[PDB]
Amino acid sequence: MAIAPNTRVLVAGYGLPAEFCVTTLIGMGVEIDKIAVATHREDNRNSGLHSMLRLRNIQFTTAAANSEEFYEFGANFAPDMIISMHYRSLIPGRFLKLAKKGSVNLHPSLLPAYRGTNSVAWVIINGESETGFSYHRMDENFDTGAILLQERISVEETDTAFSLFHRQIARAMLRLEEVILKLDQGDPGFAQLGEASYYARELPFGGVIDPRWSEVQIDRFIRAMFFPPFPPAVLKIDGKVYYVPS
Amino acid sequence: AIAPNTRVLVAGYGLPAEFCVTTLIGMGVEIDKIAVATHREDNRNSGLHSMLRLRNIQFTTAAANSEEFYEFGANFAPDMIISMHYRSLIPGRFLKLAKKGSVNLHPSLLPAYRGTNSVAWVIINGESETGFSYHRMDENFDTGAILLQERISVEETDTAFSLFHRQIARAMLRLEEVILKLDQGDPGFAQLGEASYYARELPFGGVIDPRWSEVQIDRFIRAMFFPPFPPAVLKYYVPSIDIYRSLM
């Protein structure tokens, strides 16, 4: 029902999912001096977070995940639990070991499907009618730890990377409190089950339409590349670049 | 699914508005079918401003009563207006623009706790429950028809701070549903019960009366707790009931 009083929570996070997470923790009655945040520099997605951390005087670091300052920041805070909410770096194992209740990260697929990055794009490229999000404990690798909560999200024929990425955030937030409680209560989760799949760091197909693709493949790709303000899918014709309308 | 080519103007401020925009995008509302009316970029509103700049969403920060504001709405031609912690009265003629009307998020169970400082006043008054009301706007503050209400338990450990933040959190999770009610033309249910209204004014100027019972003092301390603002004062600074007892 309620979080253990004096639970100390460290949020490794970036942007709106993180602002929402700190909001939620405060709503759960976690004291202000029992919240610590690790994040990245203030850019045009992290401005909401930063302003909140300054406004509420929430201790935070922007130091790199592999830096000694980051480890110190965690060590001095002594978290019971760590919540990764769109943090953008590999979190060292020795940092995760600081939280005796362990940790959780939000990943935008049904793990072990769509390990890697750009999951939302690839889901659409492969023509998935269904995807999901996975709140999972973190181990030393990305995308591999035990599942605390997974929920299905249906993929529509009109979805873009853009629409799906934002619905992922919105829907995942619904379950965040239950997840924070699962962590409070020591829920071990379950080992990720099923066949994995993996998709490389960089932008799918370099953003470039393959002319050999079927129309269905092209429609999917166009939508998967739609993500303002980034350029749309590129079609090359007579060795020359053209942005698609979408 | 929200009707295609539905045009949505969000009047709002801070995370609730950023989260609204996020939600509309996730629902399939395209950038050029979203417009934002907000206030200046400040320490609560730079999340929203950053998103507007990054995604090239048209917006205004012109005052609610200004011709500029009106013109931004008229020119966009909203099907619906969503007010997400917008801090000004929106003129009737602006609301008129939206054919499917409007909705506003108020953090009480209306008509109870109209006005401002709802979360603080709920705690002082010893309420055990409060909640939020998503309600159609008319030309007055806090009076229009109810689309959706949800109850929030007020715990003995709750501060204005915790309760302010839980309000936002829990309201955000009902928002998609509310957007669908507006879309589908749900007229809502007019407001019934005793109205209450509370002002801008800091209750008792933040100073603890030692004639109050411990139960009252505790509530007041909790209701005054909102970082980074100063806590309750005793005749000095008193953030917890523990600290009160010590001073006594």
Ligand SMILES: Nc1nc2c(ncn2[C@@H]2O[C@H](COP(=O)(O)OP(=O)(O)O)[C@@H](O)[C@H]2O)c(=O)[nH]1
């Ligand atoms: N068209 C385009 N889309 C992008 C680009 N970078 C990111 N995206 C989209 O934005 C989504 C989120 O990107 P990011 O926040 O970097 O997530 P991560 O790389 O998956 O951890 C990705 O799934 C892509 O769909 C880009 O350079 N071009």
Ligand SMILES: Nc1nc2c(ncn2[C@@H]2O[C@H](COP(=O)(O)OP(=O)(O)O)[C@@H](O)[C@H]2O)c(=O)[nH]1
């Ligand atoms: N202690 C203290 N709390 C404040 C002060 N101003 C605002 N707050 C708290 O912040 C909450 C939200 O303030 P605001 O965003 O202005 O909402 P409003 O109720 O619509 O005016 C209020 O309900 C108060 O609990 C202040 O000067 N001192």
Ligand SMILES: Nc1nc2c(ncn2[C@@H]2O[C@H](CO)[C@@H](O)[C@H]2O)c(=O)[nH]1
């Ligand atoms: N979730 C996830 N993130 C990754 C993976 N590989 C690289 N990244 C992150 O993506 C970034 C590349 O822009 C790197 O800094 C990593 O932090 C992966 O397999 N899974």
